[PDB]
Amino acid sequence: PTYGVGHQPYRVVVLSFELLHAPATVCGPKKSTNLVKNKCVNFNFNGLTG
Amino acid sequence: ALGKLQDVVNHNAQALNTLVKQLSSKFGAISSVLNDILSRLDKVEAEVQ
Amino acid sequence: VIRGNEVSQIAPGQTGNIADYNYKLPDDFTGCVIAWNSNKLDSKPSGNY
Amino acid sequence: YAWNRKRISNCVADYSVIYNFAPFFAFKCYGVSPTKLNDLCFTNVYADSFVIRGNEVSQIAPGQTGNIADYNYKLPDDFTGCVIAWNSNKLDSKPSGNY
Numbered sequence A: 001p002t003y004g005v006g007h008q009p010y011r012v013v014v015l016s017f018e019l020l021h022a023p024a025t026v027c028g029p030k031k032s033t034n035l036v037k038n039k040c041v042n043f044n045f046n047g048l049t050g
Numbered sequence B: 001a002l003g004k005l006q007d008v009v010n011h012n013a014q015a016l017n018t019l020v021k022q023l024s025s026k027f028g029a030i031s032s033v034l035n036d037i038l039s040r041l042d043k044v045e046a047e048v049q
Numbered sequence C: 001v002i003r004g005n006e007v008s009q010i011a012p013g014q015t016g017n018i019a020d021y022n023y024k025l026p027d028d029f030t031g032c033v034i035a036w037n038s039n040k041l042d043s044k045p046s047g048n049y
Numbered sequence D: 001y002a003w004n005r006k007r008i009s010n011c012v013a014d015y016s017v018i019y020n021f022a023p024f025f026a027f028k029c030y031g032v033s034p035t036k037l038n039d040l041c042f043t044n045v046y047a048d049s050f051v052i053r054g055n056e057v058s059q060i061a062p063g064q065t066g067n068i069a070d071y072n073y074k075l076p077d078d079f080t081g082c083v084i085a086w087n088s089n090k091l092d093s094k095p096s097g098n099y
């Protein structure tokens, strides 16, 4: 603890994210909306909008 | 014999096909799809891309 | 855990001691890095080895 | 203004053991990355040293205005080199004003 500010210990936790075409095993909290077809809609499938 | 009329057809087909194929390039960005940049990053960085 | 001078070397496209021999990130790495000081718990007057 | 110009020439320099010295956070260079000095080599190295305030380190960047950038040693805009700085309330911080 008598060292400088540059010699202090540091704890590093890194998160690595997978961005692939694999099925989404884990992702985030949205309430699902029912499916409607044959209509101009603003869809959002597995995080990608359109 | 009709090679020049065929070339008139083929050049206009090929230029449009190149123009469509040029949409998939990244040009130094992180994604070639605009919706991924809109839904993936904050304001300033997605404005840069 | 690392020292304070090697926090900036934990980045894609970096070389050095940790970033060449111990822990490396790929050049196309996406994800988040969380770093904080641990002077309260990881430091001792006799020396933490 | 008393910055001793230690002109350095004709010696093999090991740039890996600098981190064992006084605790700078990063080897803050402008123009060269601090792992490629072992193979890329220069023509003449000048060593300078001065003690300034906390909100005065940003004027030791290439291209700046302020007090050190105007009334003291101003780095040029086309500066190829490295600047090493750290906090110094351990050795050169004698009380009642270090004049």
Ligand SMILES: *[C@@H]1O[C@H](CO)[C@@H](O)[C@H](O)[C@H]1NC(C)=O
Residues within 6 Å of the ligand: D020, D021, D022
């Ligand atoms: C530099 O020298 C001073 C006094 O000579 C000494 O207290 C200090 O430990 C030295 N620096 C290192 C990194 O050993």
